[PDB]
Amino acid sequence: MYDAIVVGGGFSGLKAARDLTNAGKKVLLLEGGERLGGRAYSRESRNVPGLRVEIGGAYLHRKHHPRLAAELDRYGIPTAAASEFTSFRHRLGPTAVDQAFPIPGSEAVAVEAATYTLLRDAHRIDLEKGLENQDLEDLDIPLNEYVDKLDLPPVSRQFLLAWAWNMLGQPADQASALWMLQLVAAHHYSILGVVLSLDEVFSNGSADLVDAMSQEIPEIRLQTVVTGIDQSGDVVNVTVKDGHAFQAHSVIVATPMNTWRRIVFTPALPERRRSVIEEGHGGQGLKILIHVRGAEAGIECVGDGIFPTLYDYCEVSESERLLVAFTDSGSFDPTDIGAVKDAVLYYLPEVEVLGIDYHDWIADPLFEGPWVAPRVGQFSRVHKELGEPAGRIHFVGSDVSLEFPGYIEGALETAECAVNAILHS
Amino acid sequence: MYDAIVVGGGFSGLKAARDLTNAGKKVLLLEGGERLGGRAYSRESRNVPGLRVEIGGAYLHRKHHPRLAAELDRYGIPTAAASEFTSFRHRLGPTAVDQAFPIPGSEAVAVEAATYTLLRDAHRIDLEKGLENQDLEDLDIPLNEYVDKLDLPPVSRQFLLAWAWNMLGQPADQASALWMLQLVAAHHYSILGVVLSLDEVFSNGSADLVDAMSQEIPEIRLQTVVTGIDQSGDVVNVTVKDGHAFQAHSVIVATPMNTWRRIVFTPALPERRRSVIEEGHGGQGLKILIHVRGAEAGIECVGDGIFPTLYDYCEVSESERLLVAFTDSGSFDPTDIGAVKDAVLYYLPEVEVLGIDYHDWIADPLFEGPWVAPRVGQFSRVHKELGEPAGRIHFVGSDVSLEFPGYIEGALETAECAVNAILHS
Ligand SMILES: Cc1cc2nc3c(=O)[nH]c(=O)nc-3n(C[C@H](O)[C@H](O)[C@H](O)COP(=O)(O)OP(=O)(O)OC[C@H]3O[C@@H](n4cnc5c(N)ncnc54)[C@H](O)[C@@H]3O)c2cc1C
Ligand SMILES: Cc1cc2nc3c(=O)[nH]c(=O)nc-3n(C[C@H](O)[C@H](O)[C@H](O)COP(=O)(O)OP(=O)(O)OC[C@H]3O[C@@H](n4cnc5c(N)ncnc54)[C@H](O)[C@@H]3O)c2cc1C
Ligand SMILES: CNCCCC(=O)c1ccc(O)nc1
Ligand SMILES: CNCCCC(=O)c1ccc(O)nc1
Numbered sequence: 001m002y003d004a005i006v007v008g009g010g011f012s013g014l015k016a017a018r019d020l021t022n023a024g025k026k027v028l029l030l031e032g033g034e035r036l037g038g039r040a041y042s043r044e045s046r047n048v049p050g051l052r053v054e055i056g057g058a059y060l061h062r063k064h065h066p067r068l069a070a071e072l073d074r075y076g077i078p079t080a081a082a083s084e085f086t087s088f089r090h091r092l093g094p095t096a097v098d099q100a101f102p103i104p105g106s107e108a109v110a111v112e113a114a115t116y117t118l119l120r121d122a123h124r125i126d127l128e129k130g131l132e133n134q135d136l137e138d139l140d141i142p143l144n145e146y147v148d149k150l151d152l153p154p155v156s157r158q159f160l161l162a163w164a165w166n167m168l169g170q171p172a173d174q175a176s177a178l179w180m181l182q183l184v185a186a187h188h189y190s191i192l193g194v195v196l197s198l199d200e201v202f203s204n205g206s207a208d209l210v211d212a213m214s215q216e217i218p219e220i221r222l223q224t225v226v227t228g229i230d231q232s233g234d235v236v237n238v239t240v241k242d243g244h245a246f247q248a249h250s251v252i253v254a255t256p257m258n259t260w261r262r263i264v265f266t267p268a269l270p271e272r273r274r275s276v277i278e279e280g281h282g283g284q285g286l287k288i289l290i291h292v293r294g295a296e297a298g299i300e301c302v303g304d305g306i307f308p309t310l311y312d313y314c315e316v317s318e319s320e321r322l323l324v325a326f327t328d329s330g331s332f333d334p335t336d337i338g339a340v341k342d343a344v345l346y347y348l349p350e351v352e353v354l355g356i357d358y359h360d361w362i363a364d365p366l367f368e369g370p371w372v373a374p375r376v377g378q379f380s381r382v383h384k385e386l387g388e389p390a391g392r393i394h395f396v397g398s399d400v401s402l403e404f405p406g407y408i409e410g411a412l413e414t415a416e417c418a419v420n421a422i423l424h425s
Numbered sequence: 426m427y428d429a430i431v432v433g434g435g436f437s438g439l440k441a442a443r444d445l446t447n448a449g450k451k452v453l454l455l456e457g458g459e460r461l462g463g464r465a466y467s468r469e470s471r472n473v474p475g476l477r478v479e480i481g482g483a484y485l486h487r488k489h490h491p492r493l494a495a496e497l498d499r500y501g502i503p504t505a506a507a508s509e510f511t512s513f514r515h516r517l518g519p520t521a522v523d524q525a526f527p528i529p530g531s532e533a534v535a536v537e538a539a540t541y542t543l544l545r546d547a548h549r550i551d552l553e554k555g556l557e558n559q560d561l562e563d564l565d566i567p568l569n570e571y572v573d574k575l576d577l578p579p580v581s582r583q584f585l586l587a588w589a590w591n592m593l594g595q596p597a598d599q600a601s602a603l604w605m606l607q608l609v610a611a612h613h614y615s616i617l618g619v620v621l622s623l624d625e626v627f628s629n630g631s632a633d634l635v636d637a638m639s640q641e642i643p644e645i646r647l648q649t650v651v652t653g654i655d656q657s658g659d660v661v662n663v664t665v666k667d668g669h670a671f672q673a674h675s676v677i678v679a680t681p682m683n684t685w686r687r688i689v690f691t692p693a694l695p696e697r698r699r700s701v702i703e704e705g706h707g708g709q710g711l712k713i714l715i716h717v718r719g720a721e722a723g724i725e726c727v728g729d730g731i732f733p734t735l736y737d738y739c740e741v742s743e744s745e746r747l748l749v750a751f752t753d754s755g756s757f758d759p760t761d762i763g764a765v766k767d768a769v770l771y772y773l774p775e776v777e778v779l780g781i782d783y784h785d786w787i788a789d790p791l792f793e794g795p796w797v798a799p800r801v802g803q804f805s806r807v808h809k810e811l812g813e814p815a816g817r818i819h820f821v822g823s824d825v826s827l828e829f830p831g832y833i834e835g836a837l838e839t840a841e842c843a844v845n846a847i848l849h850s
Contacts, residue, residue, distance in 0.1 A: 101530065108526075112617050115537060116544045192537050 002028050002248040004422060005238050007226050010038025012397040012411035013254030014213040015071075019419040021217060028246060029217055030238070032225040032255070032366050036214050039256070039367065039398075040408060042205025046357040047291040048316055052205050055289070055359045057408050059198035064187065065409035067416070075212035078203040083312045087296055089347050091303025096155045100300065103156050114150040118191055122184040127403055130384020131178065139178040140380040143168075146177035162308035163195055166326040168373045169285020174330070176376045186404055225366075229253075230266040231392050250392050250422050254415070257281060257386065257399035258369035269390055272382050281399070282375035284362060286329040289313060290344060291354040295321045301347040306332055306339075310347050320354070329362050329370075371406050372399040387414060394418040427453050427673040429847060430663050432651050435463025437822040437836035438679030439638040440496075444844040446642060453671060454642055455663070457650040457680070457791050461639050464681070464792065464823075465833060467630025471782040472716040473741055477630050480714070480784045482833050484623035489612065490834035492841070500637035503628040508737045512721055514772050516728025521580045525725065528581050539575040543616055547609040552828055555809020556603065564603040565805040568593075571602035587733035588620055591751040593798045594710020599755070601801045611829055650791075654678075655691040656817050675817050675847050679840070682706060682811065682824035683794035694815055697807050706824070707800035709787060711754040714738060715769060716779040720746045726772040731757055731764075735772050745779070754787050754795075796831050797824040812839060819843040 006017045009031030017029040035041075037056075045051040059082060062069040072079060088098040096102040103111055121139060125131070139146070143164060152160065161172055167183065168175045187193035202208055214220065228239040229251055239245045253260065258280040269277065290310075300311040306327060313322040325343065333339060334356065341353050361370035374383075387400030396418045401410025431442045434456030442454040460466075462481075470476040484507060487494040497504060513523040521527040528536055546564060550556070564571070568589060577585065586597055592608065593600045612618035627633055639645065653664040654676055664670045678685065683705040694702065715735075725736040731752060738747040750768065758764060759781065766778050786795035799808075812825030821843045826835025 101533075105526065109615055109617050109621065112540060112544075112615060116541060116614075119537075119541045120545070189541075190534055190537060192534050196534065 001235065002026050002246065004028070004250045004252060005030060005236070005246055005248040006252045006254055007229075007238070008032070008038065008253065008255035008397070009036040009220070009222070010254060010397070010411060011040060011210075011213075011408055012415050013038075013252070014210070014217070015412055015415040016252050016254060016396060016419055017217045017220075018213055019415065020422065023419070023423055025422075027217070027219065028248070029220045030224045030226055030240075030246070031220065031222045034222055036220075036222075037206060037210045039361065039370070040206040040210065041359065042202075042207040045289070045322075047289070047355040048322070051314070051316065051322075053289060053314070053322070053357065054201070054206060055287075055357070056361075057206060058201055060201070060408060061197035061199040064193070064197045065404070065407065065412075067412035068409050071209060071213070071412070075209065077209050077212065079200045080203045082199055082201045083314075084298060085300040085311060086298030087300070089299060089301045091301065091305050091347055092158055093154045096159075102159060102302070107153050107156050110151070110153055111156050114152055114156070115191065117150060118181075118184065119189060122181045122189055125181060125185040127185055130402060131182065131379040132381055132383040132385065136178055137380050139181060140176050140377055141178075142173055142376055143170075143175040143177050143180055144172035146180075147172065158304050159302055162302045162304065165308040165328065167194060169283050169326070169328050169370060170373055171328060171331050174282060174284075174376065176374055176379065178380060179374050182379075182405065226255075226263060228264040228266070229393060230264075232266050236392050250394070252394045252396060252415075252418050252422075254396050254411075256367050256369055256397065257372060258283075259365075259367065260395075262365075265390075265393070270385070272385050273390075276378050276382055276386070279375070279378075281369060281372045281378065283369050283371050283373035284328040284330045285370040285373070286327055286332060286334065286362075287358060287370075288325045288327075288334055288340070289357040290323045290325060290340065291316070291320065291356070292323055292344070292348075292351050293320050293354055294351040295323060295348060297321070299323070299348070303347060305343055305346045307343045307347070310344065329360075334358060334360075369399075373406075389421060394421060426660065427451050427671065429453070429675045429677060430455060430661070430671055430673040431677045431679055432654075432663070433457070433463065433678065433680035433822070434461040434645070434647070435679060435822070435836060436465060436635075436638075436833055437840050438463075438677070439635070439642070440837055440840040441677050441679060441821060441844055442642045442645075443638055444840065445847065448844070448848055450847075452642070452644065453673070454645045455649045455651055455665075455671070456645065456647045459647055461645075461647075462631060462635045464786065464795070465631040465635065466784065467627075467632040470714070470747075472714070472780040473747070476739070476741065476747075478714060478739070478747070478782065479626070479631060480712075480782070481786075482631060483626055485626070485833060486622035486624040489618070489622045490829070490832065490837075492837035493834050496634060496638070496837070500634065502634050502637065504625045505628045507624055507626045508739075509723060510725040510736060511723030512725070514724060514726045516726065516730050516772055517583055518579045521584075527584060527727070532578050532581050535576070535578055536581050539577055539581070540616065542575060543606075543609065544614060547606045547614055550606060550610040552610055555827060556607065556804040557806055557808040557810065561603055562805050564606060565601050565802055566603075567598055567801055568595075568600040568602050568605055569597035571605075572597065583729050584727055587727045587729065590733040590753065592619060594708050594751070594753050594795060595798055596753060596756050599707060599709075599801065601799055601804065603805060604799050607804075607830065651680075651688060653689040653691070654818060655689075657691050661817050675819070677819045677821060677840075677843050677847075679821050679836075681792050681794055681822065682797060683708075684790075684792065685820075687790075690815075690818070695810070697810050698815075701803050701807055701811070704800070704803075706794060706797045706803065708794050708796050708798035709753040709755045710795040710798070711752055711757060711759065711787075712783060712795075713750045713752075713759055713765070714782040715748045715750060715765065716741070716745065716781070717748055717769070717773075717776050718745050718779055719776040720748060720773060722746070724748070724773070728772060730768055730771045732768045732772070735769065754785075759783060759785075794824075798831075814846060819846060 003025035404410035428450035829835035
């Protein structure tokens with residue numbers, strides 16, 4: 001049969017499948033859906049005929065992501081410097097200043113203090129060890145309660161909250177402080193670095209690299225949703241919705257953490273993992289592309305709106321543009337366009353909304369979640385364990401990366417590790 | 426005779442003398458020079474007839490200095506908000522920006538890192554304990570060597586150095602890193618706070634408060650330089666240059682640390698103090714007032730010039746102003762006016778120097794030093810010990826304050842303590 005079956009056709013799965021193959025193994029890639037890429041997804045725009053857009057993962061930074069840089073280099077995939085912001089319309093109160101960093105000096109001493117406390121806590125985290133193994137339980141509290149102890153003033157406090165909401169894709173009352181600290185550590189112990197790293201984009205979309213990687217996997221089955229994995233025997237048996245079983249010495253689960261509860265594992269996974277695997281992670285990130293008329297180029301807005309961030313995405317024509325909001329799907333209904341007009345108009349009262357485009361990750365059975373973000377309490381109970389092997393079954397993907405949790409990079413990184421675990425044994 | 430003699434007629438000495446008196450004791454104040462105030466010294470300007478100027482200590486901040494605030498409140502001494510800076514002519518390289526905080530974002534991540542390390546080290550310091558008692562010897566190295574390990578880029582690195590030079594009144598190769606960290610801690614663990622606190626001035630000069638305080642001391646002898654203090658007997662004997670001895674149960678030395686080596690103490694001071702008392706501290710701060718024509722109002726310059734800082738001091742007329750440079754007297758000769766024109770012109774090539782005014786603290790036998798700043802090594806050998814009693818002799822003054830070393834505030838603070846030590850016993 002096969003040396004490995006890889007379940008799931010996103011970047012994690014794609015790298016694994018290609019790497020083992022180049023190692024000379026016999027590998028099958030099984031993809032539940034009708035395309036490769038998973039949460040990296042360029043398509044043509046619902047709003048603008050002829051325009052290609054990223055409806056998932058978009059932004060990379062080469063100094064922060066060596067594994068991604070080399071893929072881009074390996075296949076000559078051109079990147080482009082992401083949108084430079086030149087025009088600032090914040091909702092941060094009358095003392096904010098319209099710059100990218102809108103903190104007034106009247107606030108500077110407080111920022112300098114809070115920055116120190118913030119980074120002091122982040123320095124507690126050792127990245128390789130896992131969040132559940134370090135006595136961090138005091139920090140796994142709600143983000144809003146934590147940011148209350150920083151004694152921050154209006155502009156900087158609200159600025160902090162807005163970006164955290166955008167990044168974590170959770171309202172402050174649901175986001176774990178520990179997890180915010182984790183993203184800080186992931187970035188070489190930089191708060192600033194967490195935002196300064198959405199920095200480049202693919203010039204022809206993520207689909208570019210998706211194709212390069214697949215042009216090198218020989219056996220791929222789309223529309224093949226896995227429903228069971230069984231390793232009670234000498235050889236792992238992988239069973240499928242409408243179709244037969246496939247068999248292998250080794251199985252890589254490269255599907256989203258929040259999907260693992262819909263698969264039947266034999267034996268059942270280790271007791272420690274089950275509860276969290278059941279509940280899933282709390283990530284509710286929601287990314288909406290907005291077709292607008294009237295917006296000038298290079299707009300950036302941060303503020304206390306239901307959209308925390310709203311900024312320039314693309315030029316369409318000289319009257320028209322796409323913008324991007326982030327916010328979360330628990331707090332917002334993207335199908336109430338009335339609400340969208342309100343949210344936008346809040347920052348930019350002179351602009352007309354022509355239409356919106358997005359994908360509803362949380363509702364896609366193939367995904368069930370956008371990017372990972374633990375619920376409060378979850379990742380100090382179990383975290384590193386989640387992406388650890390259970391027998392001959394391996395778990396990879398951004399959702400479980402310890403080094404770069406959440407990013408294309410971490411999908412690439414958890415794969416390399418599995419490929420190694422297989423190759424060595 | 427007297428319950429106390431206070432030696433030295435600066436703020437430290439003035440508060441003591443007044444406080445003991447109000448306690449009802451019998452107190453003599455002995456002042457070596459021809460005025461009261463010491464290193465707080467307003468006079469009429471050498472350059473501008475009719476203009477009153479501060480040739481010593483000038484700047485206060487009420488939130489940072491409760492002891493000073495209450496003096497000002499006690500006597501209704503009016504302050505004025507110090508010069509707001511509106512115009513910026515830095516020498517920090519082509520990427521600096523002409524703002525008060527001239528760091529470019531291209532530099533921001535590095536600043537955020539360095540700020541963290543800087544404050545982490547400063548948090549090692551416990552203020553009450555004394556610098557010699559905490560295992561800080563690793564930090565008592567030269568400032569330039571320390572600032573090399575922060576890996577700072579041009580603008581921020583040079584900005585940091587310029588303000589440190591100004592503050593410590595020492596070139597980077599002679600200043601102790603530990604001492605820079607000490608000023609950071611003194612300020613509630615704030616780097617920013619070290620400069621944001623030169624913030625108010627006396628509207629009628631420091632002489633205002635000097636008079637208020639003396640209007641309440643009943644026995645004062647000027648031109649009375651002390652040369653010996655002897656406590657071998659039952660009652661302390663204090664002997665004078667051209668004149669008799671005075672006697673007291675208790676003596677307060679409120680004269681500058683760098684003068685104590687010219688006094689004969691019986692018995693000799695404790696072995697630990699003697700070496701440092703001999704060498705004196707390394708402070709070489711030099712403050713020059715420059716009368717100029719052509720300068721616009723509100724100028725501030727920071728840079729890599731021989732003047733680290735050069736900024737607006739006062740308006741004179743609509744063509745004329747005073748500015749203030751700081752720099753150090755080891756590195757600069759203020760009697761080479763050619764050099765002064767060069768230093769100024771470096772930042773402001775369009776401006777004409779009319780004249781300069783300053784006092785040469787380091788050369789004044791009554792002072793022998795401007796503000797305190799240890800030499801490298803000194804204050805981790807002995808620091809708290811220096812301002813500790815030796816028998817019935819007490820040492821006060823800014824030079825020895827642990828809480829606010831260097832400031833009028835710390836002169837007020839070390840006095841309160843002595844007054845207490847005397848009263849309790
Ligand atoms: C809105 C949004 C914006 C983002 N923006 C960025 C960004 O700017 N920068 C960045 O670095 N990252 C970004 N990300 C994160 C990044 O996209 C993902 O975390 C990463 O691409 C995940 O890749 P993966 O290989 O781990 O999982 P996925 O790409 O999710 O791949 C999992 C695959 O499994 C398949 N699958 C699911 N169930 C089964 C089944 N049982 N059987 C077979 N196949 C199955 C799915 O079809 C999918 O193809 C963003 C994510 C979202 C949701
Ligand atoms: C240029 C300069 C600028 C400054 N700027 C500021 C500022 O902006 N803000 C701030 O808070 N602080 C500032 N300071 C610091 C502050 O002025 C001093 O540290 C503080 O005033 C010292 O007061 P003191 O009472 O300890 O000593 P001093 O004021 O120095 O008093 C000592 C007194 O002892 C007398 N004396 C010396 N020898 C004898 C002798 N043997 N017998 C009798 N009397 C003797 C002297 O005449 C003097 O009056 C500045 C200092 C300088 C030099
Ligand atoms: C845990 N990872 C949180 C970051 C989520 C994420 O990758 C992402 C990337 C870009 C953006 O604009 N918002 C969120
Ligand atoms: C140890 N104290 C260092 C600060 C020296 C000092 O008090 C001072 C005050 C104002 C100024 O502009 N430069 C120096």
